[PDB]
Every structure is written in structure tokens, then in C-alpha cells.
Amino acid sequence: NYLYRLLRKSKLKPFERDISTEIYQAGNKPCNGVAGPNCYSPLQSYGFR
């Protein structure tokens, strides 16, 4: 349930939030909603044990 964002286009200004979950792309080929090659979901899990 506890998630973090590891990929973003730019640095974040103070006291702002980013709730939207979209497919992040770091290349020329668009993801188009498919988490395939060069496509990563930004919300990653901690996984505490």
C-alpha cells in the first residue's frame, strides 16, 4: 500500500503533490498505455518485511 515515485521529468517545487499515475516514457517511442519496452510505472512499492 505504501508507494513511492522514482521517475519524473523535472524536480519538484516545495509543498506540491503529484497524485496522477501515468505511464512514464524515457525514449522516442511512445508507451501508449502499454508497459512494454522502455516503459516503467513510476509508482513502485517498498515491500517491508
Partner: protein
């Protein structure tokens, strides 16, 4: 009234001030606006 944000309708939370002769509704939520933002009267 005034509208602030990055995009509209969804995908980004948007500031929203609506003024009238009675109150002021400032509200940072998603909401629904079309491509022609206007307030209907009747």
C-alpha cells in the same frame, strides 16, 4: 470566477474559484469542464 491548473477535467487536480453574489467556492478537486468553460444561469 477563475480557473487554474495544468490540464482540465482529469489527469491533474485543478484549482477552481467560482464567484457569485452570495458566496465563494474555492475547491481543489478534479471536476468536469468542457472546452468552453462558462457558468449556466437558468
Amino acid at each position: 470566477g477563475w480557473i487554474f491548473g495544468t490540464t482540465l477535467d482529469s489527469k491533474t487536480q485543478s484549482l477552481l474559484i467560482v464567484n457569485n453574489a452570495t458566496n465563494v467556492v474555492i475547491k481543489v478537486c478534479e471536476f468536469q469542464f468542457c472546452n468552453d468553460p462558462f457558468l449556466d444561469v437558468y
